[PDB]
């Protein structure tokens, strides 16, 4: 079977983030409604030297009573609430409690942070995550 669910994460005052390379912000936890708890994690200035040009974005399995397999998709919502710049795992990945999977090079900082592209209305970054858990 499959259980599909989503979480929308609004990061307020995004331009004010002081996170340096490798520093992370995690979201509140979410679930399908569920013994599992997930959260999102973003590195606004990338995870590492290779990704310092990018936001790195991950799905974390926070609490899980030995393993689960899950496909995931992350996107950015524009001002109209439409999904843009989506990236989706080509397959399901194996999560254990405390394990994350994601995209180290999710979106170019030079793109997201340029006001002309309009993806930070009211200085808010809105990310949307869809997860499909294999049961």
């Amino acid at each position: 079977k499959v259980v599909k669910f989503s979480y929308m994460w609004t990061i307020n005052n995004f331009s004010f983030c002081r996170e340096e390379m490798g520093e992370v912000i995690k979201s509140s936890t979410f679930s399908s409604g569920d013994k599992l708890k997930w959260c999102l994690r973003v590195n606004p200035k990338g995870l590492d030297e290779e990704s310092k040009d990018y936001l790195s974005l991950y799905l974390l399995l926070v609490s899980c009573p030995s393993e689960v397999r899950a496909k995931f998709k992350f996107s950015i919502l524009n001002a109209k609430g439409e999904e843009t710049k989506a990236m989706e795992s080509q397959r399901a990945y194996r999560f254990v409690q405390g394990k994350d999977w994601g995209f180290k090079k999710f979106i170019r900082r030079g793109f997201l942070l340029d006001e002309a592209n309009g993806l930070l209305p009211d200085d808010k970054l809105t990310l949307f995550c869809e997860v499909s858990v294999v049961q």
Binding site: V24, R41, N43, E88, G98, K99, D100, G102, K104
Partner: peptide, 7 residues
Amino acid sequence: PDVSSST
């Protein structure tokens, strides 16, 4: 897209 882990 390249999927990886930070944990």
